[PDB]
Design a protein around this ligand. Structure first.
Ligand code: NAG
Lengths: 52, 52
């Protein structure tokens, strides 16, 4: 689940909303490369590992 | 953000109505048959009394 520790606000309400959902469409709300010109978008952590 | 309470209230309201509807229909369909059998029994008692 949440690999980084923290509190998920209104988790059970999110489950109750997602119970009656037939489909989803995953779309890019903010592009990573172009919508942040003056910040560093590269961020990794050891609490969430992928392929060692 | 109180969807669970709304669904609980709907569950209570839709669960009582089914029980009361079922009880009313059972009461009517049993008392009708009891009334008809009672009438047939009364006619049979008059016939037996006149014969005796
Ligand atoms: C980012 O930095 C550039 C260079 O100074 C600046 O022109 C721009 O307004 C800044 N902000 C964004 C959102 O691009």
């Amino acid at each position: 689940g949440t690999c980084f520790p923290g509190d998920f606000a209104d988790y059970e309400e999110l489950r109750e909303q997602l119970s009656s959902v037939s489909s989803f469409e995953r779309f890019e709300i903010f592009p990573k490369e172009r919508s942040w010109p003056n910040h560093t978008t590269r961020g990794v952590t050891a609490a969430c590992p992928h392929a060692m | 953000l109180e969807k669970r309470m709304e669904n609980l209230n709907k569950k209570v309201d839709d669960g009582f109505l089914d029980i009361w509807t079922y009880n009313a229909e059972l009461l009517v369909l049993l008392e009708n048959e009891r009334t008809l059998d009672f009438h047939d029994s009364n006619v049979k008692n008059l016939y037996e009394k006149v014969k005796n």
